[PDB]
Coordinates of all heavy atoms in Angstrom, one line a residue:
Chain A
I16 N 8.3 -23.6 -6.3 CA 8.8 -24.6 -5.4 C 9.1 -24.0 -4.0 O 9.7 -22.8 -4.0 CB 10.0 -25.3 -5.9 CG1 9.8 -25.9 -7.2 CG2 10.5 -26.4 -4.9 CD1 11.0 -26.2 -8.0
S18 N 11.1 -23.2 -0.9 CA 12.6 -23.3 -0.7 C 12.9 -24.1 0.6 O 14.0 -24.5 0.7 CB 13.1 -21.8 -0.4 OG 13.1 -21.1 -1.6
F19 N 11.9 -24.4 1.4 CA 12.1 -25.1 2.7 C 11.9 -26.5 2.6 O 12.7 -27.4 3.1 CB 11.3 -24.5 3.8 CG 11.5 -23.0 4.0 CD1 10.8 -22.1 3.3 CD2 12.6 -22.5 4.8 CE1 11.0 -20.6 3.5 CE2 12.8 -21.2 5.0 CZ 12.0 -20.3 4.2
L21 N 10.7 -28.1 -0.4 CA 10.8 -28.5 -1.9 C 9.5 -29.0 -2.4 O 9.4 -29.6 -3.6 CB 12.0 -29.5 -2.1 CG 13.4 -29.1 -1.6 CD1 14.4 -30.2 -2.0 CD2 13.8 -27.8 -2.3
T23 N 5.4 -28.3 -3.8 CA 4.8 -27.4 -4.7 C 3.5 -26.9 -4.0 O 3.2 -27.3 -2.8 CB 4.5 -28.0 -6.0 OG1 3.5 -29.0 -5.8 CG2 5.7 -28.6 -6.7
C49 N 5.5 -23.5 6.2 CA 7.0 -23.6 6.3 C 7.6 -22.3 6.8 O 8.6 -22.3 7.4 CB 7.6 -24.1 4.9 SG 7.2 -25.8 4.5
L50 N 6.9 -21.1 6.4 CA 7.5 -19.8 6.9 C 6.9 -19.6 8.3 O 7.4 -18.6 8.9 CB 6.9 -18.8 6.0 CG 7.5 -18.7 4.5 CD1 6.5 -18.0 3.6 CD2 8.8 -18.1 4.5
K51 N 6.1 -20.4 8.9 CA 5.6 -20.3 10.2 C 4.8 -19.0 10.4 O 4.7 -18.4 11.4 CB 6.8 -20.3 11.2 CG 7.8 -21.4 11.1 CD 7.1 -22.7 11.0 CE 8.2 -23.8 10.9 NZ 9.2 -23.8 12.0
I68 N 13.1 -13.1 4.0 CA 13.9 -12.7 5.1 C 15.1 -11.9 4.6 O 15.5 -10.8 5.2 CB 14.3 -13.9 6.0 CG1 13.0 -14.3 6.8 CG2 15.4 -13.6 6.9 CD1 13.2 -15.7 7.3
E69 N 15.8 -12.4 3.6 CA 17.1 -11.9 3.2 C 16.9 -10.7 2.3 O 17.7 -9.7 2.4 CB 17.9 -12.9 2.5 CG 18.4 -14.1 3.3 CD 19.1 -13.7 4.6 OE1 19.8 -12.6 4.6 OE2 18.9 -14.3 5.6
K71 N 14.5 -8.5 2.7 CA 13.7 -7.5 3.4 C 14.5 -6.2 3.5 O 15.6 -6.2 4.0 CB 13.2 -7.9 4.8 CG 12.2 -7.1 5.4 CD 10.8 -7.7 5.1 CE 10.4 -8.9 5.7 NZ 9.1 -9.5 5.2
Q79 N 19.1 -1.9 3.9 CA 19.4 -3.0 4.8 C 20.5 -2.6 5.7 O 20.2 -2.5 6.9 CB 19.7 -4.3 4.0 CG 18.6 -4.8 3.2 CD 19.0 -6.0 2.3 OE1 20.1 -6.1 2.0 NE2 17.9 -6.8 2.0
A83 N 21.3 -4.7 9.5 CA 20.2 -5.4 8.9 C 19.8 -6.6 9.7 O 18.5 -6.9 9.8 CB 20.6 -5.9 7.5
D84 N 20.6 -7.3 10.4 CA 20.3 -8.5 11.1 C 19.3 -8.2 12.3 O 18.6 -9.1 12.7 CB 21.4 -9.2 11.6 CG 21.6 -10.6 11.0 OD1 21.3 -10.8 9.8 OD2 22.1 -11.5 11.7
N85 N 19.3 -7.0 12.8 CA 18.5 -6.6 13.9 C 17.2 -5.9 13.4 O 16.4 -5.3 14.3 CB 19.2 -5.7 14.9 CG 20.3 -6.6 15.6 OD1 20.0 -7.6 16.1 ND2 21.4 -6.0 15.9
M86 N 16.9 -5.8 12.1 CA 15.7 -5.2 11.6 C 14.5 -6.0 12.2 O 14.5 -7.2 12.2 CB 15.8 -5.3 10.1 CG 14.6 -4.6 9.4 SD 14.5 -5.0 7.6 CE 16.2 -4.4 7.1
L87 N 13.5 -5.2 12.7 CA 12.3 -5.8 13.2 C 11.4 -6.1 12.1 O 11.2 -5.4 11.1 CB 11.6 -4.8 14.2 CG 12.4 -4.2 15.3 CD1 11.6 -3.3 16.2 CD2 13.1 -5.2 16.2
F88 N 10.6 -7.3 12.3 CA 9.6 -7.7 11.4 C 8.3 -7.5 12.0 O 8.0 -8.1 13.1 CB 9.8 -9.2 10.9 CG 11.0 -9.4 10.0 CD1 11.3 -10.7 9.6 CD2 11.8 -8.3 9.6 CE1 12.4 -11.0 8.8 CE2 12.9 -8.6 8.8 CZ 13.2 -9.9 8.4
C89 N 7.3 -6.8 11.4 CA 6.0 -6.6 11.9 C 5.3 -7.9 12.0 O 5.2 -8.7 11.0 CB 5.2 -5.6 11.1 SG 3.6 -5.3 11.7
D90 N 4.6 -8.2 13.1 CA 3.8 -9.4 13.2 C 2.4 -9.3 12.7 O 1.7 -10.3 12.7 CB 3.7 -9.8 14.7 CG 5.1 -10.3 15.2 OD1 5.7 -11.2 14.5 OD2 5.5 -10.0 16.3
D93 N 4.5 -8.1 8.3 CA 5.8 -8.6 8.1 C 6.7 -7.6 7.4 O 7.8 -8.0 6.9 CB 5.7 -9.9 7.2 CG 6.9 -10.8 7.5 OD1 7.3 -10.9 8.7 OD2 7.5 -11.3 6.5
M108 N 15.0 -3.7 22.0 CA 14.1 -4.6 21.3 C 12.8 -4.6 22.0 O 12.7 -4.8 23.2 CB 14.7 -6.0 21.2 CG 15.5 -6.3 20.0 SD 14.4 -6.9 18.7 CE 13.9 -8.5 19.3
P109 N 11.7 -4.5 21.3 CA 10.3 -4.7 21.9 C 10.1 -6.2 22.4 O 10.7 -7.1 21.8 CB 9.4 -4.4 20.8 CG 10.1 -3.6 19.8 CD 11.5 -4.1 19.9
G111 N 7.8 -9.5 23.1 CA 6.6 -10.1 22.7 C 6.3 -9.7 21.2 O 7.2 -9.2 20.5
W113 N 5.2 -7.7 18.1 CA 5.4 -6.3 17.8 C 4.7 -5.9 16.5 O 4.8 -6.6 15.5 CB 6.9 -6.0 17.6 CG 7.1 -4.5 17.3 CD1 7.1 -3.4 18.2 CD2 7.5 -4.0 16.0 NE1 7.4 -2.3 17.5 CE2 7.6 -2.6 16.1 CE3 7.6 -4.6 14.8 CZ2 7.9 -1.8 15.1 CZ3 8.0 -3.8 13.7 CH2 8.1 -2.5 13.8
Chain B
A1 N 10.1 -9.5 20.1 CA 9.8 -9.2 18.7 C 10.6 -10.1 17.7 O 11.6 -10.7 18.1 CB 10.1 -7.8 18.4
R2 N 10.2 -10.2 16.5 CA 10.9 -10.9 15.5 C 11.9 -10.0 14.7 O 11.6 -8.9 14.4 CB 9.9 -11.4 14.5 CG 10.1 -12.8 13.9 CD 8.8 -13.4 13.4 NE 7.9 -12.4 13.0 CZ 7.7 -12.1 11.7 NH1 8.3 -12.7 10.7 NH2 6.8 -11.1 11.4
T3 N 13.1 -10.5 14.6 CA 14.1 -9.8 13.8 C 14.5 -10.7 12.6 O 14.2 -11.9 12.6 CB 15.4 -9.4 14.6 OG1 16.1 -10.6 15.0 CG2 15.0 -8.6 15.8
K4 N 15.3 -10.1 11.7 CA 15.8 -10.9 10.6 C 16.6 -12.1 11.1 O 16.4 -13.2 10.6 CB 16.7 -10.0 9.6 CG 17.2 -10.7 8.4 CD 17.8 -9.8 7.5 CE 16.9 -8.7 7.0 NZ 17.2 -8.4 5.5
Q5 N 17.4 -11.8 12.1 CA 18.2 -12.9 12.7 C 17.4 -14.0 13.3 O 17.6 -15.2 13.1 CB 19.2 -12.3 13.7 CG 20.1 -13.3 14.4 CD 20.9 -12.6 15.5 OE1 20.3 -12.4 16.6 NE2 22.2 -12.4 15.3
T6 N 16.4 -13.6 14.2 CA 15.7 -14.6 14.9 C 14.7 -15.3 14.0 O 14.3 -16.5 14.2 CB 14.9 -13.9 16.1 OG1 13.9 -13.0 15.6 CG2 15.9 -13.2 17.0
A7 N 14.2 -14.6 13.0 CA 13.3 -15.3 12.0 C 14.0 -16.3 11.2 O 13.5 -17.4 10.9 CB 12.7 -14.2 11.0
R8 N 15.3 -16.0 10.8 CA 16.1 -17.0 10.1 C 16.2 -18.3 11.0 O 16.1 -19.4 10.4 CB 17.5 -16.4 9.9 CG 18.3 -17.1 8.8 CD 19.7 -16.5 8.7 NE 19.7 -15.1 8.1 CZ 20.0 -14.0 8.8 NH1 20.6 -14.1 10.0 NH2 19.9 -12.8 8.2
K9 N 16.3 -18.2 12.3 CA 16.5 -19.3 13.2 C 15.2 -20.0 13.4 O 15.1 -21.2 13.3 CB 17.2 -18.9 14.5 CG 17.8 -20.0 15.3 CD 19.0 -19.5 16.1 CE 19.9 -20.7 16.6 NZ 21.2 -20.2 17.2
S10 N 14.1 -19.3 13.8 CA 12.9 -19.8 14.2 C 12.2 -20.6 13.0 O 11.5 -21.5 13.2 CB 11.9 -18.8 14.7 OG 11.7 -17.7 13.8
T11 N 12.4 -20.0 11.8 CA 11.9 -20.6 10.6 C 12.4 -22.0 10.3 O 11.6 -22.9 9.9 CB 12.0 -19.7 9.4 OG1 11.5 -18.4 9.7 CG2 11.3 -20.2 8.2
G12 N 13.7 -22.1 10.5 CA 14.4 -23.3 10.0 C 15.1 -23.2 8.7 O 14.7 -22.2 7.9
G13 N 16.1 -24.0 8.5 CA 17.0 -23.8 7.3 C 16.3 -24.2 6.0 O 15.4 -25.0 6.0
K14 N 16.7 -23.6 4.9 CA 16.2 -23.9 3.6 C 16.8 -25.3 3.2 O 17.8 -25.7 3.7 CB 16.6 -22.8 2.6 CG 16.0 -21.5 2.9 CD 16.6 -20.5 1.9 CE 15.9 -19.1 2.1 NZ 14.7 -18.9 1.3
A15 N 16.1 -25.9 2.3 CA 16.6 -27.2 1.7 C 17.9 -26.9 0.9 O 18.1 -25.8 0.4 CB 15.6 -27.8 0.9
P16 N 18.7 -27.9 0.7 CA 20.0 -27.8 -0.1 C 19.7 -27.2 -1.5 O 18.8 -27.7 -2.2 CB 20.6 -29.1 0.0 CG 20.0 -29.8 1.2 CD 18.6 -29.3 1.3
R17 N 20.5 -26.2 -1.9 CA 20.2 -25.6 -3.2 C 20.3 -26.6 -4.3 O 19.5 -26.5 -5.2 CB 21.2 -24.4 -3.4 CG 21.1 -23.3 -2.3 CD 22.4 -22.4 -2.4 NE 23.4 -23.0 -1.4 CZ 24.6 -22.5 -1.4 NH1 25.0 -21.5 -2.2 NH2 25.5 -23.0 -0.5
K18 N 21.3 -27.5 -4.3 CA 21.3 -28.5 -5.4 C 20.1 -29.3 -5.5 O 19.6 -29.6 -6.6 CB 22.5 -29.3 -5.1 CG 23.9 -28.7 -5.4 CD 25.1 -29.7 -5.1 CE 25.1 -30.7 -6.1 NZ 26.2 -31.7 -5.9
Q19 N 19.4 -29.6 -4.4 CA 18.2 -30.4 -4.4 C 17.0 -29.5 -4.9 O 16.1 -30.0 -5.7 CB 17.9 -30.9 -3.0 CG 18.8 -32.0 -2.6 CD 18.6 -32.4 -1.1 OE1 19.6 -32.7 -0.4 NE2 17.4 -32.5 -0.6
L20 N 17.0 -28.2 -4.6 CA 16.0 -27.3 -5.2 C 16.3 -27.2 -6.7 O 15.3 -26.9 -7.4 CB 16.2 -25.9 -4.5 CG 15.3 -24.7 -5.0 CD1 13.9 -24.9 -4.6 CD2 15.9 -23.4 -4.5
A21 N 17.5 -27.3 -7.2 CA 17.8 -27.3 -8.6 C 17.3 -28.6 -9.3 O 16.7 -28.4 -10.4 CB 19.2 -27.0 -8.8
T22 N 17.6 -29.7 -8.8 CA 17.2 -31.0 -9.4 C 15.7 -31.1 -9.4 O 15.1 -31.7 -10.3 CB 17.8 -32.2 -8.7 OG1 17.2 -32.2 -7.3 CG2 19.3 -32.1 -8.6
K23 N 15.0 -30.4 -8.5 CA 13.6 -30.4 -8.4 C 13.0 -29.5 -9.6 O 12.2 -29.9 -10.4 CB 13.0 -29.8 -7.1 CG 11.5 -29.6 -7.1 CD 10.8 -30.9 -7.0 CE 9.3 -30.6 -6.7 NZ 8.4 -31.9 -6.8
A24 N 13.6 -28.3 -9.7 CA 13.2 -27.4 -10.8 C 13.7 -27.8 -12.2 O 13.3 -27.1 -13.1 CB 13.7 -26.0 -10.4
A25 N 14.4 -28.9 -12.3 CA 14.8 -29.4 -13.6 C 13.9 -30.5 -14.1 O 14.0 -30.9 -15.2 CB 16.3 -29.9 -13.5

Side-chain angles (χ1 to χ4, degrees):
Chain A
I16 301 160
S18 290
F19 302 94
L21 303 182
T23 68
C49 290
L50 293 157
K51 312 309 181 56
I68 286 163
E69 295 308 324
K71 196 88 74 187
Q79 295 177 333
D84 245 34
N85 288 319
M86 186 190 300
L87 309 181
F88 293 175
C89 179
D90 286 318
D93 210 43
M108 263 275 291
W113 178 79
Chain B
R2 216 155 33 97
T3 66
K4 185 172 298 220
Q5 177 190 76
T6 67
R8 199 180 293 121
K9 198 153 196 164
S10 60
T11 303
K14 296 177 177 267
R17 295 163 272 169
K18 289 179 68 177
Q19 290 170 222
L20 176 73
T22 66
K23 174 71 172 176

